[PDB]
Design a binder for this molecule. Structure first.
Ligand SMILES: C[C@]12CC[C@@H]3c4ccc(O)cc4CC[C@H]3[C@@H]1CC[C@@H]2O
Ligand SMILES: C[C@]12CC[C@@H]3c4ccc(O)cc4CC[C@H]3[C@@H]1CC[C@@H]2O
Ligand SMILES: N[C@@H](CCC(=O)N[C@@H](CS)C(=O)NCC(=O)O)C(=O)O
Ligand SMILES: N[C@@H](CCC(=O)N[C@@H](CS)C(=O)NCC(=O)O)C(=O)O
Lengths: 219, 225
């Protein structure tokens, strides 16, 4: 049976999965879970995913509750022989390492900031603290790009799909003007056909955050 | 060349790698990085791992900066064909899924709490807030174990090694009285010879945290056997 993706396109890790789906022409049934209405706490979705998070994928009996597993699963099932999830062990571990950076560091800091806005209101958030934490992530990615065109080497991989959606989201608030490699990489990502899958949810997130946070992003 | 592990055994994700190294009898060189002295900000270690975190593995030219990548790499290289990182695709995805739960949810909440203690002192932490967040993680692990014997299926996998070290750390502070599947599973993990690699760093972390945060963990909380 075809995969079912539970999603809210305001979520960057959702948008990474949407980008992979578009890149690989995957036939997926979409089911919208409105996070800002708390639908991720509805009894049946909670039973499916106790972490009450999107993206969640149901593919037959397999239930995945993390975008990075979903990216790897879909690449392994629908892109055997591709370069997104490379077959050679060392290259694959490098992609995996950067997927985990996205999970552990970049998204953690993005989510910490966005959560603070939703909970406290933008006027009551320590923006300087979060600017420091998120600029530290920019600095790391700029170094990651020193000897490669893409995040994990010379070719586009799953790591780029995972990072670019969160990066585009952090970049709602914090510009890339000071980071030449990161800005060039982001511009190149924006040229890919599959990047169109990021656009609608980024803008919906912008609009939702500004309304819920009572502020305007600088951009 | 033999793998090199940059480590501070007080870190639960370090201890997960130590457990796998013991379980598989991998010969690894250990290089200590004292996180409470800020040695992870030394210029050469920062150049190696810009995230200034342990564990960090150097294996030949490969540099891994996340425990979950280290566990998977070492299982592929030293448990080839084995069941810790299982061969069938769906079983492997389940293990990967719970490795990411550890990274995204359980460890995130453990480190939010531990960092707050170190940065603020225990007396100035909103302990009730962190109790709610960490009990929520207990509830989720209890749900996974209501439907499966181990975290990711019927046998020991990398997911159990990743999760048990952080669970043992959270349980320094928060009791498991209300979580019978978690207690049964944790007890079984404690019977494994490989669990001996968790014990020393767990106790060092307890000692360090009590000192730096000026508090005592409730001795009654930790599951011991
Ligand atoms: C604010 C929430 C936590 C942080 C989530 C987040 C975190 C990071 C991000 O880039 C986008 C979002 C959108 C949905 C947000 C969630 C909607 C309700 C929930 O509490
Ligand atoms: C407190 C730090 C962040 C949280 C880290 C942590 C986070 C979770 C945990 O179980 C153990 C530790 C030990 C090292 C801690 C770090 C040493 C200094 C750093 O600031
Ligand atoms: N590591 C997870 C993070 C998933 C996550 O945190 N999703 C957020 C949206 S960006 C969510 O669903 N929040 C709802 C909630 O926590 O209640 C992944 O990569 O899928
Ligand atoms: N997701 C990473 C988490 C690594 C991590 O945060 N390690 C902590 C210790 S538990 C660390 O090294 N903190 C030092 C610092 O941030 O400066 C992994 O699994 O390896």
């Amino acid at each position: 049976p075809k995969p079912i993706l539970y999603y809210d396109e305001r979520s960057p890790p959702v948008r990474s999965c949407l980008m992979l789906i578009k890149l690989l022409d995957i036939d997926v049934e979409l089911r919208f879970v409105n996070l800002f209405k708390g639908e991720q706490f509805q009894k049946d979705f909670l039973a499916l995913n106790p972490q009450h998070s999107v993206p969640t994928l149901v593919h037959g009996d397999l239930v995945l509750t993390d975008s990075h597993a979903i990216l790897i699963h879909l690449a392994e099932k629908f892109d055997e022989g591709g370069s997104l999830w490379p077959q050679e062990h060392a290259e694959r571990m490098k992609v995996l390492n950067l997927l985990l950076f996205e999970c552990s560091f970049l998204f953690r800091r993005d989510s910490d900031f966005m959560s603070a806005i939703v909970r406290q209101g933008f006027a009551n958030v320590d923006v300087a603290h979060h600017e420091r934490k998120l600029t530290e992530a920019y600095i790391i990615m700029e170094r990651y790009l020193e000897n490669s065109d893409f995040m994990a080497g010379p070719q586009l991989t799953l790591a780029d799909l995972s990072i670019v959606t969160t990066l585009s989201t952090v970049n709602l608030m914090f510009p890339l003007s000071q980071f030449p490699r990161l800005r060039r990489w982001f511009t190149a990502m924006q040229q890919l056909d599959a990047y169109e899958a990021n656009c609608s949810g980024l803008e919906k997130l912008r609009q939702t955050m500004e309304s819920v946070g009572s502020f305007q992003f600088p951009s």
